[PDB]
Write a structure and sequence with these properties.
Chain A: It is found in: Sarcoplasmic reticulum membrane. This is part of a larger assembly, with 2 copies of chain A. Helix content of chain A is about 65%, strand content about 0%. Chain A has 20 helices and 2 strands. The radius of gyration of chain A is 24 Å and the shape is globular.
């Protein structure tokens, strides 16, 4: 049913919309950008003699193009057939790639959202989602991109992250405030990230191995994901997805730059709240994978050795976890799941470790901050 | 009995255009060396400008069913609608294909159509489909039909692009009707006889001088005159002439006595013509018309003209034979007979005198396919390098 639909659509090219008819077209990115201005203008968006009374034409065009791209991406053949080398599957994917450029998809993903904002009175003025650009539009873009073009280049992965993904996670982390959490835009952005953007990064976990020189972007991604995980309004399934993605990326991640998130970990874990499950699991798996980096003086030749700053942080982590766990009341899963974490930290820690006499001075006050932690 | 197109036949793909409310017939053309991309060659004004069908002829290698083509890719038959066909450029020897690269001629959903060296892959293969309900899938293809060609690789139609100011050929989702004209049939071609479109040498009655232009002394205007030389000129490429008929369809047919044709110098790409002063001088394609460039072969100098015999479709009957038949060139309109002026590397000038001399007969010899290929390559490369030198000098 997919090959037939693709063939009928290509035989009738007018079904692709004026942007993608080819003759005198402007491209999907230009069409969405023009739909932005159409949505901004009242006269072009509405009749002018909510939705039932006034169909928002900008959103209508946006949704039409998003639905077309989504349908084509779903029509894309399964990857197992391409691995088997099936000629029809290869031909169909080639046709879809010719139909839709990758640059247009990257641009549409790069298109930014308009954040909801608080007002003078203290009321959150909420932009009408049905009027403008919605996260599902980019969710369809991502589905097409990962089902047709494929995401298999490390450089392309980093480029896509920086241009389009990381800003959305940063926006979600900024909206994660309790007053602005209830906004429908926050809910839709959470759905978009947890369904399209983040599982894509989960499936792209192995590619993250060669990210040594782009330390800043991966550190920002890690920190934004952790901040999103420390969110009140996230559902149970969304929390499961974010936990799985973060633990998948951390495992493949280089051991070096993740101490920038360990520094927040040593401050958040000893609280032993319900939010601390994913953090301590991350500590467990990371320390079990990188035990010989810490204990053995040389470590892995490619990885290197500790800077003794990470050694001090792990000492603080270990002792804080031990004290909090000792004074903590007995909870079944908490002490079932903390045993591997504490044990792995102890094993990683060198027995001969000189504790540094240098205390840290003037730490990140955002880290000591807890009411928003900024 | 309507004859049917069959494999191993030479055909030209022609499409009709409607620029400013007139129908002009355009044939698909390509050039082997250099530009791989195909273009269009006009055949409507054949009386004013000669058509170059040597770069428009294609051969039907194999006609296969879609499933047979799929099985072969996984690993003389009459063409049927819906079959997969292979087209090879007769001149270049490379096959038609979808280049998978676009010139960005304002059509984002389009692919350029050109020639490809290798036959592997589905880019070279094309599927022929009926134009209207008069034909049907599985039916035999008639010599006179309109065909829409769908590339197997991209499911795109062989399309004539009106969008650009210049008419182009490309693989697009819009369909353009193509009509196939049979040029020649190899199996029905009698060996040793003259066929239309043959590169050949005019050996004069002494069997040791050829009709040729002056040597390449770098004088292009000096190259224009025509005369007789003997010796190595019979082995050089400066004495090669291609016999082009005045008809587009069935151009590769046995030439009969009295049939008009045009003689083109392969090296210089210029056509033999009779000026008003009775002196032969090579003209350019732009100003080579039927009035001056038409010539015929006569069995004897006897004055009883053959009148008018209507050209017959098919390969025809073989009359003029290579190396033994004696031919006399007569200009169609003036009626003059080609002869040697005998004014005195003989360099004996050739003029046309309606009385003529007694040993005016000329024998015919075939140039090798390698020789013709090399001569055309030399002409193309000379043109390109001269353009490059002019640009560098500017």
């Amino acid at each position: 049913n997919a090959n037939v639909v693709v063939r009928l659509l290509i035989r009738r090219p007018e079904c692709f919309g004026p942007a993608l008819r080819g003759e005198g077209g402007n491209g999907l990115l230009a069409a969405m950008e023009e739909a932005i201005k159409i949505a901004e203008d009242p006269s072009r968006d509405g009749p002018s003699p909510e939705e039932d009374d006034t169909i928002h034409m900008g959103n209508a065009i946006m949704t039409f193009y998003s639905a077309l791209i989504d349908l084509l991406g779903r029509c894309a053949p399964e990857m197992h057939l391409i691995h088997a080398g099936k000629g029809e599957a290869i031909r169909i994917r080639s046709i879809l790639r010719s139909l839709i450029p990758l640059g247009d998809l990257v641009g549409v993903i790069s298109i930014a959202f308009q954040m909801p904002t608080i007002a003078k009175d203290g009321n959150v003025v909420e932009p009408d989602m049905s009027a403008g650009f919605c996260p599902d539009h980019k969710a369809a873009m991502v589905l097409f991109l990962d089902r047709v073009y494929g995401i298999e280049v490390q450089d392309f992965l980093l480029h896509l992250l920086e241009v389009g993904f990381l800003p959305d996670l940063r926006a979600a982390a900024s909206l994660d405030t309790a007053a602005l959490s209830a906004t429908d835009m926050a809910l839709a952005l959470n759905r978009y990230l947890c369904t399209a953007v983040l599982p894509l990064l989960t499936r792209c976990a192995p590619l993250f191995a060669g990210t040594e020189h782009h330390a800043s972007l991966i550190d920002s991604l890690l920190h934004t994901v952790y901040r999103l995980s420390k969110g009140c309004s996230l559902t149970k399934a969304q929390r499961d997805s974010i936990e799985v993605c973060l633990l998948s990326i951390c495992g493949q991640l280089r051991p070096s730059m993740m101490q920038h998130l360990l520094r927040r970990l040593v401050f958040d874990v000893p609280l032993l709240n319900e939010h601390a499950k994913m953090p301590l699991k991350l500590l467990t798996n990371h320390y079990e994978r990188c035990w010989k980096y810490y204990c053995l003086p040389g470590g892995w030749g490619n990885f290197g050795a500790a800077s003794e700053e990470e050694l001090h942080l792990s000492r603080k982590l270990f002792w804080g976890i031990f004290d909090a766990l000792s004074q903590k009341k007995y909870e079944q899963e908490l002490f079932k799941l903390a045993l591997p974490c504490l044990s792995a930290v102890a094993g990683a820690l060198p027995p001969d470790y000189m504790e540094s006499n240098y205390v840290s001075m003037m730490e990140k006050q955002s880290s000591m901050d807890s009411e928003g932690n900024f | 009995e309507i004859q049917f197109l069959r494999t191993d036949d030479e055909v030209v793909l022609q499409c009709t255009a409607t620029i400013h409310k007139e129908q002009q017939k355009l044939c698909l053309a390509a050039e082997g060396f250099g530009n791989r991309l195909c273009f269009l060659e006009s055949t409507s004004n054949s009386k004013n400008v000669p058509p170059d069908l040597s770069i428009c002829t294609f051969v039907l290698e194999q006609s296969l069913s879609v499933r047979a083509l799929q099985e072969m890719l996984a690993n003389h038959r009459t063409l049927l609608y819906g079959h997969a066909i292979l087209l090879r450029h007769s001149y270049s020897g490379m096959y038609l294909c979808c280049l998978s690269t676009s010139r960005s001629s304002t059509d984002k959903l389009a692919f350029d159509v050109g020639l490809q060296e290798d036959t592997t892959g589905e880019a070279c293969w094309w599927t022929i489909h009926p134009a209207s309900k008069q034909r049907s899938e599985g039916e035999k293809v008639r010599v006179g039909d309109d065909l829409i060609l769908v590339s197997v690789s991209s499911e795109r139609y062989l399309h004539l692009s009106y969008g650009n100011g210049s008419l182009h050929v490309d693989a697009a989702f819009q369909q353009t009707l193509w009509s196939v004209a049979p040029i020649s049939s190899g199996s029905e071609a009698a060996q040793g006889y003259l066929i239309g479109g043959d590169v050949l040498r005019l050996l004069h009655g002494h069997m040791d001088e050829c009709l040729t232009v002056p040597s390449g002394e770098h004088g292009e205007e000096q190259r224009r005159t025509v005369h007789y030389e003997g010796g190595a000129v019979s082995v050089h490429a400066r004495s090669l002439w291609r016999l082009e008929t005045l008809r587009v369809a069935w151009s590769g047919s046995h030439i009969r006595w009295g049939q008009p044709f045009r003689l083109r110098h392969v090296t210089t790409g210029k056509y033999l013509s009779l000026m008003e002063d009775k002196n032969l001088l090579l003209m350019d394609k732009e100003k080579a018309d039927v009035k001056s460039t038409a010539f015929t072969f006569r069995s004897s100098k006897e004055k009883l003209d053959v009148g008018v015999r209507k050209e017959v479709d098919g390969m025809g009957t073989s009359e003029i034979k290579y190396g033994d038949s004696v031919c006399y060139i007569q200009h169609v309109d003036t009626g003059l007979w080609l002869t040697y002026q005998s004014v005195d590397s003989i360099q004996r000038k050739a003029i046309m005198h309606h009385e003529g001399h007694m040993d005016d007969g000329i024998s015919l010899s075939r140039s090798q396919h390698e020789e013709s290929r090399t001569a055309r390559v030399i002409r193309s490369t000379v043109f390109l390098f001269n353009r490059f030198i002019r640009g560098l000098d500017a």
